[PDB]
Design an enzyme around this catalytic site. Structure first.
Site, PDB file in Angstrom:
ATOM      1  N   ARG B  60       0.815  -1.211  -0.078  1.00  0.00           N
ATOM      2  CA  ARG B  60      -0.168   0.018   0.123  1.00  0.00           C
ATOM      3  C   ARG B  60       0.623   1.501   0.032  1.00  0.00           C
ATOM      4  O   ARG B  60       1.768   1.490   0.782  1.00  0.00           O
ATOM      5  CB  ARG B  60      -0.866  -0.087   0.982  1.00  0.00           C
ATOM      6  CG  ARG B  60      -1.585   1.531   1.724  1.00  0.00           C
ATOM      7  CD  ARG B  60      -2.414   1.002   2.913  1.00  0.00           C
ATOM      8  NE  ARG B  60      -2.182   2.204   3.784  1.00  0.00           N
ATOM      9  CZ  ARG B  60      -2.975   3.382   3.808  1.00  0.00           C
ATOM     10  NH1 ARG B  60      -3.917   3.211   2.820  1.00  0.00           N
ATOM     11  NH2 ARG B  60      -3.035   4.268   4.665  1.00  0.00           N
ATOM     12  N   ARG B 107      -4.125  18.932   7.800  1.00  0.00           N
ATOM     13  CA  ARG B 107      -3.157  19.060   8.568  1.00  0.00           C
ATOM     14  C   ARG B 107      -2.512  20.266   9.295  1.00  0.00           C
ATOM     15  O   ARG B 107      -2.927  21.399   8.718  1.00  0.00           O
ATOM     16  CB  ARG B 107      -1.916  18.185   7.649  1.00  0.00           C
ATOM     17  CG  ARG B 107      -2.435  16.959   7.005  1.00  0.00           C
ATOM     18  CD  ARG B 107      -1.330  16.050   6.826  1.00  0.00           C
ATOM     19  NE  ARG B 107      -0.671  15.286   7.598  1.00  0.00           N
ATOM     20  CZ  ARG B 107      -1.222  14.302   8.071  1.00  0.00           C
ATOM     21  NH1 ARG B 107      -2.105  13.338   7.480  1.00  0.00           N
ATOM     22  NH2 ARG B 107      -0.306  13.341   9.268  1.00  0.00           N
ATOM     23  N   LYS B 257     -13.199   3.937   1.389  1.00  0.00           N
ATOM     24  CA  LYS B 257     -12.900   3.859   2.901  1.00  0.00           C
ATOM     25  C   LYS B 257     -13.969   4.760   3.753  1.00  0.00           C
ATOM     26  O   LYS B 257     -14.157   5.917   3.312  1.00  0.00           O
ATOM     27  CB  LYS B 257     -11.580   4.582   2.717  1.00  0.00           C
ATOM     28  CG  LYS B 257     -10.231   3.811   2.321  1.00  0.00           C
ATOM     29  CD  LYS B 257      -9.098   4.263   2.628  1.00  0.00           C
ATOM     30  CE  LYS B 257      -8.822   5.888   2.674  1.00  0.00           C
ATOM     31  NZ  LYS B 257      -7.303   6.140   3.179  1.00  0.00           N
ATOM     32  N   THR B 315      -6.077   0.176  10.293  1.00  0.00           N
ATOM     33  CA  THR B 315      -5.668   1.123  11.224  1.00  0.00           C
ATOM     34  C   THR B 315      -5.267   0.592  12.833  1.00  0.00           C
ATOM     35  O   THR B 315      -6.533   0.202  13.235  1.00  0.00           O
ATOM     36  CB  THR B 315      -6.558   2.229  11.219  1.00  0.00           C
ATOM     37  OG1 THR B 315      -6.401   2.876   9.862  1.00  0.00           O
ATOM     38  CG2 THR B 315      -5.679   3.549  12.177  1.00  0.00           C
TER      39      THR B 315
END
Lengths: 512, 512, 512, 512
Positions: B60, B107, B257, B315
């Site tokens: 990934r 972010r 996702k 995760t």
């Protein structure tokens, strides 16, 4: 709604019952085999053809009555009637011949002057029973000559004796030296040569006797497909039957009849040794208390199902139809519940052997059975049979389970199986698919024996064995494929399952 | 006792648990796919080879970091490590490459003063946020820059801001033009460029941005096998990623996702448009309360299992292993349970991207996953997917349910499948057979994409295509027959299921 | 939709998962009991009140550290905080006191003459282990002292040794006779008195040491509610702890901790003897391989549920939270799956003993537990617990199954049970009702011990006995009634079930 | 093994059948009620007494024959027979009286002068049907008169007309103004006043004619316990009966007889307006094809079970016994299967109204039903009823399921229910406990109506009411205990469930 598919979609068995609908028609193809007793009323080639037309799959010849000539002629007629349709492979319906053996039965003698003459036994009135052959031709209201000579040694004082279907019951007031002095419990008209039952008694008559050996050997001469063996009590009795059938008769299917307490008890022993079982309710209902029969029946059908072997329910299923054109509501329910129980074949005795309406009785059973099959709760039957099915090493067995599971998914119209001995097909039937199993074989005998299994439709291919195998397989498959469309099991569009070989290959294809 | 055969044979689920024996070795065949995020800790071609031997199936690439040159290089190394085993089909294992889009994330800036020297956000103290690019690299305990230039329009006094995977939480205590003056809830260390979460705010960032457009086209240029799309909130989002992947990437599998509330609500709509789903517990556990994440997960794995589409649990499955050589008991419980719920794939992020024990992390998932597959209760599971599965007219769909039912019957060594697009194999896998599903193809990409489905083991053929189709088929069956014995999936004597074809032919054959 | 009612109302288990909705909260009542380890971070009488307010039901005292003096103070504080709420019956919550033994553990000694010293260990470096007491305070990177004076007798060349909860791992290179030469397998920071595990080695340490004997006697002296017995390997071990507690401590509940291979092997024997079980995952995950812990845990919880004995899941459920204000995703799903598995109680060790967020940890378990308790598929749990439940002659047992069946049928807000010893409340609880089991007792110890069972809410009655019987019963039934309405359990109309007497009477009554 | 406790205790219904044993006796208590039609054969006080001793629970009066005078005398004798055992509560058995309406039935007239000498109709012969009252008592093989003056208007050329239980069959060849010219399909003997059915035609006769109103009003004057309403076609018919019964007869139970196609079509609305249902196979199997009757039956029994209302299976259950002392095997099977289906009561008509063996007929049903009840598969039954049963807020409903769960869990010898109306006892019965339900009541009408439910044994208390409510309660409970112990239900040891008062109290108490 069609073939009770709404009832089949329910999660519970209760919800299933609730959804059963009388305005939801079944699928033309009836899966339960019909076994008819051929006698005076059904013996003619003429009526015999109507019988095949009405649904008969197997002809039963009762060897407790009649000479071989009589039966050999019956057998010839069954075959004349059956081959009458041989011209076209779309009308040809293989019919099997089954031989029921007299077996260890006790019978009374001939009434005074003649058997047609009758007599009336009244309660309390004592009655004499002698093994003295002077009275056999002279059976009367005061003296009753028996068949079983070593009786008294097995009947204690006080015991009971049931004559004629158990309708007449007696009571031994005292065990004589070589004679019995009874006392009617509930009289009635005592005709001649009426069976006798000694419940609680331990009869010693040979499982297989001289007469049985000659009739059994006669069947091998006659080339019958199966033997319904009367009074099986232990696995050792079935072995004697195989023995007698010898090597020449090794392929004849042996159906053990359970008609008494011991057989019921030694059932597991007997099932393992047999090819199939017949719940012979008539005698069993006299041998054990009548309210217990339903339990013995469900016990036996359950185990045969579980074991993967044919089980036949029989006797008095449409009694009433011996005299009338329609059955009672009890008889109607009887047949349905047998099919729903899991019986491969339902049978008819007097209804077709000597009754006034053999064709209506055969037609009635095709009707009930077809309805009863649609009403089956498969989501639970299939799941239960799998879980109880032993983990196998045999590829054909895994092919069978895999094939029936696909037939439920694509709701398939048929499971075409190419088999020579019929085993592959038998292996598919134990899992009880809803789709009909069309068995294409060249062996006319396996084709006839196919009828002992639920849902197997035998299609006898005559075409010569193609030079090339791949072609010969394609040939036997187009055979089923065309006869099937012709017989109406499916149309050009329908998805169908095909099993070929050693039978370990499965193909899901569209009908050509 | 072996592979929990004592437990996976119980009538009740409780009974199943009671029979789980930690002394019952599993089948060396691990069914759950492992996806590893690549980074500094695993990028070395040399350690990449080790990742593969340790169990990695899918590499990934996290496009939320690095440049196109960086990833293009990771891809090369990944392919170098992968093709280094190609010289032998027995050792070769296809490895798929996945491209994970950055998506509309938010972010913080860079810490000033001393290096990245985390800044301590003390509980109760205030923290001013600006979008003024002057401080975009001067972050500290008093000012925090952010890249969401349209943040003040979607927040308000009271709003909650979460920094670095939700470890730091802020409450807006005074909005402003180009700045907010929040108050520190529960503190912690603030590093550089940490992701930010606004649960309850409507962040207008587009599903797919220009930057994401670039990456997607790059993925297509680079030939990736699958795109892990971030923040899929509606079916519309998924449709955009399809538009960009366009014609050249029409074969790339799109995994949506789920990491926000809306996405969990409009879930079914999303699952309809996606080729598969991924439970991004990371963001999801910040966007919705942490206590509810397990529900969202069991629900999405459940709906994906039914729907028959691949699902990935990801995760923090083994967080602790970023710094420790062994995992905590919560981490082990987690992975086992994801497999038990039904996850087709489990994924590692930090663990292999930058951790100190990338290899130990991958081996731990192979071990956990293997043990968990054995402990599965295939009894209730299979029957349940059968019941919930719609009926179809589809030939291949029944040949699969058939293939699986028959593999359970004869404890088959494996279910061998010849397929070109892999669908034939994706169909068998949606029924969750115990037996391993070996997919044999000549198409290199379908080999790589099979890793997304539970139980499929890619065996890529190289031999040319025989003009003789029939013949060509046996060439590949044997192919898998050897690679299978070799890798120890089964012994000669064993029984194996072969699904050939347009896949409609199933066969149960003993291994040569 | 609330408390996942739409989901618990589903035919299949997979369709149950598919219905788990993140937007469907439960009842403010949480059934899974919470055990918190008391330590430096939570002894302040002040902090203990908050622990109680956050959800703590049991205070766990780790006797592997601290003196009898230290712990008498701890117990003193716990009881002080607990009684601070005893003024008002609506806010008073019984907190149980648990003593956990040191048991047969191996610990290293002090580093550089102190217990605050941390030496560094490098992978590849060698380390000598000695038993010369003259080193127990002389430990560094080259030498290490251990408690187990017979270590060399069970550790061979090649055997691996684990130090500090398995973080540090060494491999024996040279097995001597009085010392050992190892090689650091994985580096780490070594502190003083760290735990040591010898997987494979057959340590001989006593089940109950002399220190264990004093600590257990101290227990009875301090009037503790339960004993968590470490490293129990067989029934005779549990029988020793009992002999020690003796008549005076006969009522103290004994929980055997399963933390080694043999305890798992001889689990059934151990359950018979113990009052309950603890799945001590920490040591168990080092003793047995990590990938098998979930098997051990799923099996143990399964068996205790079968037996109706309390089972506890412990260690590292929220590790992350020792240093962080929020748990990881793996920790989220571990505490939930623990409850879904059927654990009566979940535990916190370091999270509340020495961490920085003792209160945050507790609150996070209360939350996860509630969400997981609603997602429980009772339809399947209840029924399996019945079929597997034996047929008894005991009125109370039949009354409990009767009460639980009734609670589901009319969605009851509670099952009020009156018991002196607690057994009655225990019996209702093994069937797992959805409704909170409110247990009214005048006995304090049983009030505290009720926490070992899933769903038993203890409510201590301080009201003097009624001179008459019947009226005393109502005094208690109405007591549960008041406190019940007060704590939110139910309203005034609401349907409740009340069990009284010997508990063989069930009444379905509306609240007064 | 006794009472199929080995069989009725398996995990699959199939395994259940396999375990049924003919060598395991049941609990003397027979739960299925037996309704016997009274006629010439059973009318005397003398044989009535014996009938009660044989198991008769309800006396049916067929109102399609006999005058009000005649029926009043029948009621007098039944009540005389019943009260002769009144001189001792241990032998007394409530016996209900049921009035069965004539309804809109069509009948032929009287055969010519030559006695009731039935006439012979032969297939082919032509028969003319006249409505000319001149031929009313002059019926012959040429002319047949009927009382349906509109037969010609509802019939078409080709319709089918059945006479005498559907045995004679006619097809209309020519339709005249006041006549018809038919051809005989299948003939037989036709006596006088035979029933006529017109399947397909919409018979315009009213469901509740003038004579019906007179008969129902007579039923009220005589205090009958229930009414069997013939040919109910829709809910408006059931209501019509209710109005006629009025206020005086507001407690009389209305049982609707479904004996035609509209009735089965609109069954759901009929079931809703009725107190209970009767599957009238007689007419129903002429009205619709006989092959479908079994589906109708299982559907109605299943929907009444699901609704908790009484359902009765009737007609030709033991037909054979009208002339023989033993039933056929179809009849034995039929009765048994009716019980297994879920029928609350079974009925006898001709068998007890006019046969030669009424007492044997009744005793045979007592035997089959008992055997059948032990073989019920309660596991699935209870489970499904509980699954299919709605969630309720009603206390008694909850107490009732609770009592049944408890009664399984502790093999109770009985569930004693104190009830005035019968309601609470009816609520227990719908869940089908294995244990017998003893309903203690002072009310004679609810004690008699209790026979309409499976497993409810009425015990009519004579003792006067105590001033102390609670003392009266124990008086009645003690009554059950004694009468129960004295009647074989249980012993000094055994456990029993006792429900008392809105019946919301349950107690598991050992027998005093």
């Amino acid at each position: 709604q069609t073939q009770q598919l709404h009832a089949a979609m329910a999660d519970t068995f209760l919800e299933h019952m609730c959804r059963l609908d009388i305005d939801s028609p079944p699928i033309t193809a009836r899966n339960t085999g019909i076994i008819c007793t051929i006698g005076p009323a059904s013996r003619s080639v003429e009526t015999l053809k109507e019988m095949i037309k009405s649904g008969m799959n197997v002809a039963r010849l009762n060897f407790s009555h009649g000479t071989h000539e009589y039966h050999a002629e019956t057998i010839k007629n069954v075959r004349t009637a059956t081959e009458s349709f041989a011209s076209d492979p779309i009308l040809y319906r293989p019919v099997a011949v089954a031989l029921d053996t007299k077996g260890p039965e006790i019978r009374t003698g001939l009434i005074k002057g003649s058997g047609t003459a009758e007599v009336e036994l009244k309660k309390g009135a004592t009655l004499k029973i002698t093994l003295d052959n002077a009275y056999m031709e002279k059976c009367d209201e005061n003296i009753l000559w028996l068949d079983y000579k070593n009786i008294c040694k097995v009947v204690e004082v006080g015991s009971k004796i049931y004559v004629d279907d158990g309708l007449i019951s007696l009571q031994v007031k005292q065990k004589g030296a070589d004679f019995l002095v009874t006392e009617v419990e509930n009289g009635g008209s005592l005709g001649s040569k009426k069976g006798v039952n000694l419940p609680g008694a331990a009869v010693d008559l040979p499982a297989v006797s001289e007469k049985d050996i000659q009739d059994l050997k006669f069947g091998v001469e006659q080339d019958v497909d199966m033997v319904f063996a009367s009074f099986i009590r232990k696995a050792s009795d079935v072995h004697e039957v195989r023995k007698v059938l010898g090597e020449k008769g090794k392929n004849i299917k042996i159906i053990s009849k359970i008609e008494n307490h011991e057989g019921v008890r030694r059932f597991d022993e007997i099932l393992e040794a047999s090819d199939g079982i017949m719940v012979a309710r008539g005698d069993l209902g006299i041998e054990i208390p009548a309210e217990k029969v339903f339990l013995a029946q469900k016990m036996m059908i359950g185990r045969c199902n579980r074991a993967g072997k044919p089980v036949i329910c029989a006797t008095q299923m449409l009694e009433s139809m011996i005299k009338k054109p329609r059955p009672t509501r009890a008889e109607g329910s009887d047949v349905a519940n047998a099919v729903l129980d899991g019986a491969d074949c339902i049978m008819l005795s007097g209804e077709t052997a000597k009754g006034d309406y053999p064709l209506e009785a055969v037609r009635m059973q095709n009707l009930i059975a077809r309805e009863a099959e649609a009403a089956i709760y498969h989501l639970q039957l299939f799941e239960e049979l799998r879980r109880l099915a032993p983990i196998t090493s045999d590829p054909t067995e895994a092919t069978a389970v895999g094939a029936v599971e696909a037939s439920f998914k694509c709701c398939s119209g048929a499971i075409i199986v190419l088999t020579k001995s019929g085993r592959s097909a038998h292996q598919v039937a134990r899992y009880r698919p809803r789709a009909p199993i069309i068995a294409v074989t060249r062996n006319p005998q396996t084709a006839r024996q196919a009828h002992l299994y639920r849902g197997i439709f035998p299609v006898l291919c005559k075409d010569p064995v193609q030079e090339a195998w791949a072609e010969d397989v394609d040939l036997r498959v187009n055979f089923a494929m065309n006869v099937g469309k012709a017989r109406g099991f499916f149309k050009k569009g329908d998805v169908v399952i095909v099993l070929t070989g050693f039978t370990n290959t499965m193909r899901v294809v569209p009908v050509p």
